[PDB]
């Protein structure tokens, strides 16, 4: 429906109040049923007015205008709902035309660390809420792990590039605001063995089906058999995968054993039978010989001896009947063996492709993932096809940055927080002699988890962060994933296909250049380096890793079809000191709860919160994404405004 759809698009149930709404509106839940229905309608229709036209600010007055009777009559409740939705960033978020220009005297001074999507989203909110906001960004650009290469007509995303579903996705709103050109990803992804041969359809299908089968087995082990802690250690997804493969190998070998036993037994029966038919030919040879040796006792003798001779033949002809029905049963058995192996050597390599794809999706080798929790975010997937940003995802943070006080080339080195306020200390990345000191009432830290894990610390906290936060930083996974960009002057691949896969020769290197993306207007390919290969490959110079791309592609389309690229780019996110990786993942021995702990603000001991945290690693239901980064900034802006302007 329509107002129904607005709730859905806001990740809210259209027909009941959430717990957050129940806290901010206790008189509503405690009150008559009909009025709680009134609340839900005001909320849904207010979301719908906004989502219908997310390019201009939706004011209280304008909401009151467009409410039909009797709703437009309950002026106070409308204001309460509008204010709540605005405060929590469910309306008037992203970038939109302000109706009321910004309050001229600010209230409260917030420093935001980092100018990625989480920091920008929070920043625009705090500025709308009337606060003095400055961002400190260490790079010479905004966007952080949204990073787009642009030169000539070439566009290519080195960080995030995929928009997941649009249903429920806040990026659907930002896309409308920023005029993002999205494009649904076509599902077809042909695979080429390491020699360049296409994987036949039967094998692509067969192997993929066994991949889905194996993964659900690990989920059955985890969530039905509690196979989660083994010998004091938490089970990794990769470890579970080796277990369920080992059992399929055992089953294959068992039916092979039973089959050899059927054969031997039937062979022994034939062996025994043929010997026994032999002794009956000897018994007939010995009676046949007495038949030519042949009076009324000799007259009756022939009848008796013919009766005798032809009865042993009826024994023998009958046995050659059983002789047939055996060597038939035998002949069929040598014809229909069960499988000799669970996975042929090529089958295994193809299967390792699908594992690599999963190491791509999680930015880490499977042996590092929590078996129990690595997909704990799946209940929150958006609906609709996934899309790529044909014009470069940077358009989002660049649009978000408009009008913000953003200080680039300004690297934070120490964050001091006390009951009386905060001081952020930064150096200029261009003249590290130059030092700045930023007094403020609160600090929002969107530093990536990779930077927080850095030992010795890139950024120092005074006082040090509490143990409960630092141990969560240490538990959580921070993965890695890299891209090679190949720009050509001509398209030599299939333009109808967005994706094709390269199947590697070994398990350990299964993620090296395993997936190619065809996303853009100019002749560009992205190749992913995933899993174990991600971090190791950063140690290869661009020229050589590109040479290896060109070799794979020349294997697939021929050596004459692949010209030398005109421009190349290679990401190295792990060695990037402003990132130290690509995104978080749920490590074995962590859980979604560490994402809540990460979001927890800090209060210096007796008191009011001072140090706040946003970023993809702080949002339990949408981690490792752009939209989760965005939602996390919006959340912290609400939390900070509640504290410094009133709830
Ligand atoms: C890297 C990457 C790649 C390569 C790819 C991708 C990605 C990544 N992803 C993820 C995203 O991107 C993320 O999450 C976001 O971006 C977030 O963000 P934040 O949180 O905001 O962070 P950043 O950006 O980084 O920011 C921060 C800042 O800070 C700064 N600094 C540092 N240090 C310092 C500073 N400042 C001052 N001082 C100092 N000291 C920096 O520089 C920055 O700026 C993604 N996502 C999405 O959504 N999509 C996509 O596509 C992506 N990608 C891939 O490809 C895949 C992934 C994924 C997907 F797709 C899906 C899903 Br469900 C998942 F999970 C994932």
XYZ file of C-alpha atoms and ligand atoms in Angstrom:
713
model
C 0.000 0.000 0.000
C 0.863 3.717 0.470
C 1.282 4.742 4.097
C 2.007 1.058 4.719
C 4.818 1.367 2.169
C 6.237 4.425 3.921
C 6.679 2.463 7.145
C 8.268 -0.390 5.238
C 10.620 1.966 3.414
C 11.572 3.290 6.879
C 12.260 -0.194 8.284
C 9.288 0.190 10.612
C 6.222 -1.979 11.240
C 3.277 -0.052 9.861
C 0.769 -1.471 12.350
C 2.497 -1.373 15.713
C 4.736 0.984 17.632
C 8.383 0.109 18.011
C 10.055 0.001 21.398
C 11.807 3.293 20.701
C 8.475 4.931 19.888
C 7.003 3.391 23.044
C 9.702 5.074 25.144
C 9.318 8.518 23.593
C 5.480 8.248 23.688
C 4.616 6.370 26.912
C 1.223 8.077 27.155
C 0.294 6.616 23.763
C 0.889 2.936 24.593
C -0.708 3.391 28.006
C -3.768 4.942 26.347
C -6.791 3.862 24.290
C -6.288 1.613 21.265
C -7.878 4.003 18.779
C -5.443 6.786 19.656
C -2.429 4.508 19.189
C -3.870 3.866 15.731
C -4.031 7.646 15.256
C -0.361 7.849 16.251
C 0.641 5.189 13.755
C -1.214 7.017 10.987
C 0.382 10.387 11.715
C 3.771 8.674 11.716
C 3.188 6.699 8.516
C 1.731 9.603 6.570
C 4.522 11.872 7.769
C 7.046 9.364 6.496
C 5.121 9.192 3.226
C 5.085 12.959 2.716
C 8.851 12.949 3.155
C 9.656 9.876 1.055
C 7.336 11.119 -1.675
C 9.427 14.279 -2.038
C 12.787 13.857 -0.308
C 14.331 16.799 -2.164
C 12.867 19.515 0.096
C 12.605 19.806 3.854
C 9.324 18.511 5.304
C 8.339 20.999 7.982
C 5.842 20.617 10.770
C 3.584 23.268 9.247
C 3.631 21.512 5.880
C 2.827 18.184 7.482
C -0.112 19.729 9.297
C -1.331 21.150 5.992
C -1.376 17.855 4.113
C -3.021 15.805 6.864
C -6.671 15.123 6.125
C -9.285 15.577 8.812
C -9.441 14.696 11.673
C -5.683 14.355 11.834
C -4.903 17.976 10.912
C -6.920 18.929 14.020
C -4.676 17.325 16.648
C -1.975 19.937 16.332
C 0.045 18.778 19.352
C 0.294 15.099 18.509
C 1.371 15.962 14.960
C 4.126 18.162 16.334
C 5.225 15.403 18.712
C 5.442 12.889 15.874
C 7.122 15.226 13.383
C 9.732 16.179 15.973
C 10.488 12.587 16.871
C 10.880 11.524 13.236
C 13.094 14.506 12.519
C 15.254 13.973 15.603
C 15.914 10.325 14.749
C 16.751 11.126 11.144
C 13.758 9.377 9.589
C 12.680 12.577 7.830
C 14.798 15.502 6.642
C 17.983 13.511 6.270
C 20.613 13.481 3.564
C 20.746 16.556 1.369
C 17.600 18.567 0.620
C 16.476 22.175 0.156
C 16.034 23.854 3.530
C 12.840 25.804 3.982
C 13.952 27.480 7.200
C 17.578 28.689 6.752
C 20.028 27.610 9.408
C 19.823 29.083 12.938
C 22.416 31.800 13.133
C 23.549 31.326 16.750
C 24.780 27.745 17.148
C 24.359 25.585 20.251
C 27.161 23.218 21.210
C 30.449 22.418 19.463
C 30.942 18.917 18.003
C 34.078 17.653 16.285
C 33.497 14.711 13.954
C 36.474 12.477 13.159
C 36.372 11.295 9.605
C 34.397 12.479 6.632
C 33.025 9.210 5.281
C 29.323 8.503 4.949
C 28.817 7.983 8.692
C 30.541 11.275 9.545
C 28.902 13.232 6.740
C 25.422 11.922 7.590
C 25.804 12.808 11.261
C 27.339 16.178 10.357
C 24.440 17.244 8.143
C 22.025 16.337 10.934
C 23.854 18.188 13.679
C 24.092 21.233 11.389
C 20.350 21.032 10.761
C 19.799 20.730 14.514
C 21.648 24.032 14.919
C 25.028 22.989 16.313
C 28.587 24.083 15.547
C 29.998 21.084 13.631
C 33.487 20.616 12.185
C 34.780 17.477 10.493
C 38.445 16.495 10.654
C 39.374 14.313 7.683
C 42.857 12.904 7.296
C 42.677 12.332 3.536
C 42.592 15.018 0.841
C 39.045 13.987 -0.084
C 35.765 13.061 1.542
C 33.957 9.726 1.250
C 36.460 7.499 3.066
C 35.769 3.959 1.897
C 33.566 5.372 -0.829
C 36.324 6.250 -3.308
C 35.803 6.823 -7.023
C 38.524 6.995 -9.655
C 37.782 9.592 -12.356
C 39.960 10.542 -15.317
C 38.631 11.452 -18.744
C 35.462 9.449 -19.419
C 36.564 6.686 -17.004
C 34.610 6.127 -13.777
C 35.385 3.267 -11.370
C 34.689 2.700 -7.665
C 37.629 1.496 -5.573
C 35.583 1.114 -2.391
C 31.860 0.480 -2.151
C 30.091 0.087 -5.518
C 26.944 -1.963 -4.885
C 23.634 -0.735 -3.542
C 21.803 -3.698 -2.074
C 17.994 -3.710 -2.251
C 16.128 -0.405 -2.377
C 13.206 -1.568 -0.248
C 13.878 -0.269 3.254
C 17.218 1.101 2.109
C 17.834 4.758 3.116
C 20.141 5.029 0.142
C 17.002 5.016 -1.999
C 16.264 8.452 -0.570
C 19.823 9.701 -0.996
C 19.882 8.372 -4.557
C 16.862 10.545 -5.388
C 18.491 13.515 -3.625
C 21.862 13.184 -5.367
C 20.670 12.004 -8.808
C 22.606 8.764 -8.549
C 22.520 6.617 -11.664
C 21.960 3.105 -10.348
C 21.689 -0.022 -12.488
C 20.377 -3.462 -11.549
C 23.034 -6.160 -11.703
C 22.275 -8.892 -14.194
C 22.543 -12.225 -12.458
C 24.408 -14.222 -15.118
C 28.018 -14.868 -14.098
C 29.837 -17.269 -16.406
C 32.911 -18.960 -15.006
C 36.153 -19.774 -16.779
C 38.521 -22.434 -15.556
C 42.111 -21.354 -15.040
C 42.927 -22.398 -18.622
C 40.206 -20.065 -19.943
C 37.698 -22.807 -20.789
C 34.131 -21.951 -19.900
C 32.602 -24.079 -17.175
C 29.883 -26.222 -18.791
C 26.356 -25.483 -17.663
C 25.868 -28.863 -16.029
C 28.999 -28.340 -13.960
C 28.342 -24.711 -13.016
C 24.883 -25.844 -11.913
C 25.999 -29.046 -10.236
C 28.800 -27.366 -8.300
C 26.703 -24.372 -7.247
C 23.984 -26.679 -5.930
C 26.531 -28.555 -3.831
C 27.804 -25.217 -2.536
C 24.336 -24.222 -1.350
C 23.941 -27.710 0.147
C 27.198 -27.593 2.110
C 26.480 -24.124 3.529
C 23.046 -25.086 4.821
C 24.646 -28.096 6.505
C 26.944 -25.779 8.472
C 23.855 -23.799 9.422
C 22.116 -26.987 10.549
C 25.146 -27.926 12.648
C 25.211 -24.495 14.227
C 21.552 -23.650 14.777
C 20.124 -27.128 15.314
C 23.019 -29.170 16.745
C 24.903 -26.427 18.689
C 28.200 -27.281 17.008
C 29.662 -23.977 18.056
C 32.414 -24.540 20.636
C 34.850 -27.369 20.009
C 37.748 -28.160 22.331
C 37.501 -24.712 23.953
C 37.568 -22.914 20.623
C 34.714 -21.286 18.680
C 33.953 -23.041 15.413
C 34.717 -21.058 12.292
C 32.536 -21.234 9.217
C 35.518 -22.475 7.240
C 36.062 -25.184 9.819
C 32.436 -26.265 9.644
C 32.723 -26.355 5.857
C 35.644 -28.772 6.099
C 33.602 -31.003 8.410
C 30.553 -31.301 6.163
C 32.784 -31.876 3.137
C 34.591 -34.627 5.033
C 31.313 -36.428 5.698
C 30.281 -36.245 2.044
C 33.691 -37.728 1.219
C 33.016 -40.525 3.714
C 29.584 -41.210 2.265
C 31.045 -41.380 -1.248
C 33.666 -43.870 -0.094
C 31.054 -45.984 1.742
C 28.765 -46.525 -1.225
C 31.918 -47.338 -3.177
C 32.753 -49.965 -0.565
C 29.243 -51.447 -0.589
C 29.496 -51.559 -4.367
C 32.771 -53.472 -4.351
C 31.149 -55.850 -1.850
C 28.169 -56.446 -4.148
C 30.593 -57.228 -6.963
C 32.840 -59.609 -5.006
C 29.845 -61.483 -3.599
C 28.302 -61.889 -7.030
C 31.738 -62.897 -8.340
C 32.076 -65.579 -5.672
C 28.596 -66.915 -6.489
C 29.527 -67.196 -10.157
C 32.874 -68.765 -9.218
C 31.180 -71.344 -6.980
C 28.399 -72.007 -9.487
C 30.677 -72.555 -12.477
C 32.787 -74.997 -10.480
C 29.606 -76.857 -9.502
C 28.407 -76.993 -13.108
C 31.850 -78.415 -13.879
C 31.430 -81.310 -11.447
C 28.027 -82.004 -13.029
C 29.561 -82.217 -16.514
C 32.040 -84.708 -15.030
C 29.076 -86.498 -13.436
C 27.416 -86.529 -16.862
C 30.598 -87.458 -18.723
C 30.726 -90.385 -16.288
C 27.082 -91.322 -16.909
C 27.199 -90.597 -20.643
C 30.045 -93.135 -20.823
C 27.850 -95.816 -19.252
C 25.194 -95.144 -21.894
C 27.001 -96.626 -24.917
C 27.987 -99.723 -22.897
C 24.278 -100.468 -23.438
C 17.555 -108.747 -22.768
C 14.671 -107.413 -20.632
C 16.853 -106.220 -17.745
C 18.974 -104.493 -20.421
C 15.796 -103.281 -22.149
C 14.561 -101.721 -18.904
C 18.189 -100.608 -18.377
C 18.078 -98.135 -21.254
C 14.891 -96.495 -19.962
C 16.451 -96.196 -16.515
C 19.745 -94.876 -17.884
C 18.119 -92.465 -20.333
C 15.859 -91.320 -17.500
C 19.034 -90.891 -15.458
C 21.081 -89.130 -18.143
C 18.449 -86.590 -19.156
C 17.655 -85.752 -15.505
C 21.229 -84.622 -14.779
C 20.938 -82.480 -17.911
C 17.789 -80.919 -16.446
C 19.981 -80.186 -13.409
C 22.656 -78.645 -15.656
C 20.424 -76.668 -18.024
C 18.720 -75.229 -14.947
C 22.062 -74.180 -13.458
C 23.065 -72.381 -16.672
C 19.787 -70.459 -16.221
C 21.010 -69.207 -12.846
C 24.426 -68.749 -14.449
C 22.880 -66.168 -16.772
C 20.851 -64.217 -14.203
C 24.062 -63.807 -12.183
C 26.561 -62.640 -14.829
C 23.761 -60.325 -15.910
C 23.483 -58.958 -12.362
C 27.292 -58.766 -12.396
C 27.555 -57.105 -15.809
C 25.105 -54.403 -14.745
C 27.156 -53.725 -11.604
C 30.454 -53.087 -13.405
C 28.328 -50.722 -15.534
C 26.668 -48.558 -12.829
C 29.323 -47.724 -10.219
C 28.543 -45.013 -7.715
C 30.739 -41.935 -7.860
C 34.438 -42.550 -7.359
C 35.102 -39.192 -5.662
C 32.964 -36.614 -3.976
C 34.600 -33.788 -5.936
C 36.711 -34.068 -9.035
C 39.831 -31.902 -9.021
C 38.151 -29.395 -11.352
C 34.919 -29.662 -9.335
C 36.882 -28.698 -6.233
C 38.444 -25.672 -7.961
C 35.029 -24.582 -9.221
C 33.695 -25.026 -5.691
C 36.551 -22.929 -4.372
C 35.242 -20.155 -6.635
C 31.979 -20.040 -4.699
C 33.923 -20.000 -1.427
C 35.967 -17.104 -2.782
C 32.732 -15.293 -3.591
C 31.766 -15.685 0.065
C 35.172 -14.454 1.211
C 34.489 -11.474 -1.047
C 31.101 -10.848 0.565
C 32.622 -11.054 4.033
C 36.069 -9.544 3.253
C 37.860 -12.343 5.086
C 38.891 -15.998 4.773
C 36.095 -18.330 5.814
C 38.252 -19.803 8.567
C 37.936 -16.484 10.420
C 34.136 -16.153 10.471
C 31.917 -17.041 13.400
C 30.023 -20.172 12.395
C 27.159 -19.170 14.716
C 26.876 -15.470 13.798
C 28.605 -14.640 10.506
C 25.227 -14.013 8.824
C 23.404 -12.519 11.818
C 22.495 -9.458 9.695
C 20.464 -11.493 7.166
C 17.088 -10.920 8.833
C 17.450 -7.257 7.793
C 18.314 -7.579 4.076
C 16.525 -5.069 1.872
C 14.117 -6.219 -0.809
C 14.778 -5.698 -4.522
C 17.608 -6.295 -6.963
C 21.132 -5.145 -6.111
C 22.494 -2.259 -8.126
C 25.780 -0.686 -9.100
C 26.475 3.031 -9.179
C 27.104 3.661 -12.866
C 28.245 7.260 -12.224
C 30.508 6.589 -9.243
C 29.477 6.220 -5.616
C 31.599 9.279 -4.666
C 28.654 11.394 -5.869
C 26.914 10.604 -2.537
C 29.568 11.839 -0.054
C 30.529 14.740 -2.309
C 26.908 15.865 -2.343
C 26.669 15.256 1.427
C 29.697 17.496 2.053
C 28.048 20.628 0.613
C 28.204 23.508 3.102
C 29.905 21.543 5.894
C 32.942 22.838 7.799
C 35.337 20.093 6.654
C 39.086 20.247 7.321
C 40.992 17.948 4.963
C 44.606 16.813 5.284
C 43.991 17.017 9.011
C 44.888 13.794 10.786
C 43.678 13.289 14.359
C 46.421 11.994 16.650
C 44.881 12.291 20.139
C 41.384 12.646 21.580
C 41.103 14.034 25.110
C 37.762 13.865 26.912
C 36.841 14.943 30.432
C 33.707 15.943 32.312
C 34.244 19.575 31.247
C 34.622 19.063 27.503
C 36.979 17.699 24.876
C 40.089 18.519 22.858
C 40.971 16.865 19.575
C 44.590 17.188 18.473
C 45.496 16.892 14.792
C 48.473 17.392 12.502
C 48.506 18.596 8.923
C 49.379 15.647 6.704
C 51.165 18.078 4.344
C 53.339 19.870 6.935
C 53.287 17.595 10.014
C 55.137 20.359 11.866
C 51.771 22.165 11.886
C 49.540 21.159 14.837
C 45.927 22.090 15.602
C 43.858 21.790 18.794
C 40.048 21.702 18.675
C 38.118 22.436 21.865
C 34.583 21.032 21.839
C 31.730 19.714 23.974
C 31.553 16.276 22.333
C 33.496 14.155 19.859
C 31.910 11.814 17.322
C 34.498 9.215 16.306
C 33.832 7.487 12.984
C 37.396 6.161 12.655
C 37.288 2.729 10.982
C 37.653 -0.377 13.100
C 40.965 -0.988 11.329
C 42.295 2.275 12.718
C 41.040 1.481 16.228
C 42.775 -1.922 16.157
C 46.097 -0.385 15.103
C 48.918 -1.160 17.507
C 50.676 1.042 18.302
C 47.552 3.236 18.159
C 47.244 5.751 15.353
C 44.956 7.828 17.591
C 45.440 8.126 21.340
C 42.615 8.519 23.849
C 43.029 10.472 27.078
C 41.933 8.830 29.289
C 42.395 5.481 27.508
C 39.219 3.829 26.336
C 37.576 1.484 28.886
C 38.431 -2.199 28.798
C 34.901 -3.093 27.735
C 35.337 -1.116 24.524
C 38.933 -2.065 23.751
C 38.263 -5.783 24.131
C 35.340 -5.450 21.738
C 37.609 -3.679 19.238
C 40.023 -6.604 19.611
C 37.365 -9.337 19.216
C 35.713 -7.888 16.123
C 36.883 -8.816 12.639
C 38.156 -6.233 10.158
C 38.485 -7.736 6.702
C 40.049 -6.738 3.418
C 39.195 -6.747 -0.276
C 40.911 -5.115 -3.233
C 40.133 -4.152 -6.796
C 42.167 -3.892 -9.963
C 40.743 -1.355 -12.437
C 41.499 -1.919 -16.125
C 40.608 0.935 -18.493
C 40.740 0.118 -22.230
C 39.969 2.023 -25.419
C 37.752 -0.795 -26.781
C 35.324 -3.336 -25.319
C 36.448 -6.922 -25.980
C 34.159 -8.709 -23.478
C 30.419 -9.434 -23.442
C 28.589 -6.140 -22.869
C 25.389 -7.969 -21.980
C 27.120 -9.536 -18.950
C 27.898 -7.559 -15.787
C 29.961 -10.274 -14.121
C 32.210 -13.110 -15.059
C 34.288 -15.369 -12.860
C 37.835 -16.707 -13.099
C 38.284 -20.052 -11.375
C 41.645 -20.327 -9.700
C 43.934 -23.320 -9.636
C 44.367 -23.628 -5.825
C 42.317 -23.276 -2.659
C 44.720 -20.881 -0.999
C 44.757 -18.496 -3.986
C 41.076 -18.944 -4.800
C 40.399 -15.266 -4.294
C 43.078 -13.866 -6.627
C 41.288 -11.998 -9.436
C 38.341 -14.341 -9.169
C 35.491 -11.992 -10.132
C 35.298 -9.451 -12.960
C 32.796 -6.588 -13.075
C 31.543 -4.745 -16.166
C 29.768 -1.772 -14.664
C 30.497 1.424 -16.577
C 30.075 3.521 -19.741
C 33.759 3.421 -20.720
C 35.599 0.127 -21.408
C 36.488 -0.690 -17.767
C 36.764 -3.966 -15.869
C 37.024 -4.377 -12.114
C 38.717 -7.531 -10.871
C 38.364 -8.490 -7.199
C 41.178 -9.833 -5.028
C 39.445 -11.588 -2.146
C 40.152 -13.709 0.889
C 43.690 -14.750 1.709
C 44.769 -13.229 -1.593
C 43.490 -9.750 -0.617
C 46.195 -8.855 1.877
C 49.045 -10.786 0.285
C 48.523 -9.304 -3.198
C 48.975 -5.752 -1.857
C 52.696 -6.611 -1.932
C 52.680 -6.878 -5.755
C 53.469 -3.840 -7.877
C 50.641 -2.596 -10.076
C 52.428 -3.609 -13.276
C 52.656 -7.257 -12.281
C 49.209 -7.675 -10.823
C 47.794 -6.069 -13.995
C 49.925 -8.395 -16.107
C 48.192 -11.218 -14.245
C 44.786 -9.741 -15.019
C 45.665 -9.407 -18.688
C 46.833 -13.017 -18.671
C 43.549 -14.324 -17.240
C 41.550 -12.235 -19.734
C 43.776 -13.262 -22.631
C 43.042 -16.857 -21.662
C 39.300 -16.179 -21.879
C 39.089 -14.079 -25.064
C 42.397 -14.842 -26.789
C 45.732 -13.062 -26.760
C 44.851 -10.943 -29.800
C 41.590 -9.677 -28.288
C 43.077 -7.983 -25.210
C 44.897 -4.696 -25.835
C 47.151 -3.145 -23.266
C 45.079 -0.991 -20.880
C 45.234 2.775 -21.215
C 44.829 3.380 -17.446
C 44.970 1.095 -14.424
C 44.280 1.557 -10.712
C 44.878 -0.894 -7.852
C 43.450 -0.537 -4.337
C 45.451 -1.484 -1.233
C 42.966 -1.026 1.582
C 44.897 -2.950 4.245
C 48.034 -0.820 3.870
C 45.877 2.325 3.622
C 46.540 3.887 7.050
C 43.222 5.764 7.085
C 41.367 2.441 6.718
C 43.590 -0.562 7.565
C 41.123 -2.859 5.821
C 37.844 -2.826 3.918
C 35.016 -3.561 6.343
C 34.190 -5.434 9.517
C 32.997 -9.044 9.723
C 31.764 -11.161 12.595
C 34.867 -12.997 13.765
C 34.777 -16.381 15.430
C 34.411 -15.548 19.096
C 32.625 -12.269 18.445
C 28.908 -11.686 17.848
C 26.500 -8.937 16.894
C 26.658 -7.762 20.483
C 30.132 -6.325 19.905
C 28.493 -3.991 17.378
C 26.266 -2.643 20.151
C 29.264 -2.208 22.432
C 31.031 -0.307 19.675
C 28.130 2.136 19.427
C 28.176 2.822 23.178
C 29.237 6.376 24.089
C 31.819 7.036 26.793
C 31.299 9.074 29.970
C 34.277 10.062 32.155
C 33.651 8.629 35.620
C 31.720 10.676 38.261
C 28.387 12.794 34.618
C 27.379 13.124 30.924
C 28.492 11.363 27.712
C 31.304 12.956 25.779
C 32.781 10.511 23.242
C 30.489 8.983 20.606
C 30.971 6.347 17.915
C 29.548 5.862 14.450
C 30.590 3.880 11.409
C 29.858 0.645 9.663
C 31.279 -1.251 12.666
C 28.773 0.233 15.123
C 25.433 -0.847 13.645
C 24.516 -4.421 14.494
C 21.743 -4.819 11.902
C 23.508 -3.365 8.860
C 27.268 -3.651 9.377
C 29.958 -3.327 6.706
C 27.746 -1.276 4.364
C 27.282 2.274 3.158
C 23.694 2.410 4.368
C 24.722 1.121 7.779
C 27.406 3.779 7.976
C 24.718 6.306 7.029
C 22.138 5.019 9.489
C 24.819 5.016 12.177
C 25.649 8.681 11.662
C 21.946 9.590 11.728
C 21.532 7.667 14.987
C 24.446 9.377 16.737
C 23.280 12.811 15.656
C 20.015 12.031 17.385
C 21.768 10.754 20.492
C 24.021 13.802 20.696
C 21.187 16.287 20.095
C 19.120 14.528 22.768
C 22.001 15.121 25.184
C 22.982 18.680 24.236
C 19.633 20.156 23.156
C 17.150 18.053 25.173
C 15.195 14.868 24.450
C 36.674 -0.732 1.143
C 35.393 -1.302 0.589
C 35.430 -1.992 -0.719
C 36.760 -2.117 -1.432
C 34.250 -2.490 -1.252
C 33.070 -2.359 -0.526
C 33.025 -1.696 0.785
C 34.202 -1.176 1.293
N 31.812 -1.559 1.479
C 31.816 -1.075 2.855
C 31.432 0.402 2.914
O 32.150 1.142 1.910
C 31.706 0.967 4.303
O 30.901 0.266 5.269
C 31.314 2.445 4.408
O 32.025 3.252 3.468
C 31.492 2.906 5.857
O 32.153 4.143 5.985
P 32.374 4.838 7.416
O 31.874 3.921 8.497
O 31.871 6.243 7.418
O 33.982 4.816 7.433
P 34.919 5.552 6.374
O 34.235 5.800 5.049
O 36.253 4.870 6.314
O 35.095 6.921 7.197
C 36.184 7.069 8.103
C 36.916 8.344 7.752
O 37.898 8.629 8.749
C 39.076 9.076 8.080
N 40.194 8.896 9.015
C 40.852 7.755 9.280
N 41.805 7.975 10.222
C 41.755 9.282 10.557
C 40.683 9.887 9.762
N 40.407 11.213 9.900
C 41.104 11.952 10.770
N 42.096 11.462 11.537
C 42.474 10.171 11.488
N 43.474 9.697 12.262
C 39.116 8.224 6.842
O 39.942 8.781 5.828
C 37.659 8.211 6.437
O 37.357 9.346 5.606
C 30.645 -1.692 0.761
N 29.476 -1.223 1.209
C 28.373 -1.259 0.437
O 27.304 -0.820 0.926
N 28.396 -1.745 -0.813
C 29.501 -2.220 -1.390
O 29.496 -2.669 -2.555
C 30.750 -2.201 -0.610
N 31.910 -2.761 -1.036
C 31.987 -4.187 -1.711
O 32.200 -4.253 -2.884
C 30.950 -5.091 -1.100
C 30.647 -4.835 0.373
C 29.371 -5.255 0.903
C 28.180 -5.408 0.130
F 28.169 -5.136 -1.182
C 26.975 -5.870 0.703
C 26.955 -6.175 2.071
Br 25.303 -6.825 2.929
C 28.135 -6.010 2.832
F 28.155 -6.270 4.129
C 29.299 -5.564 2.239
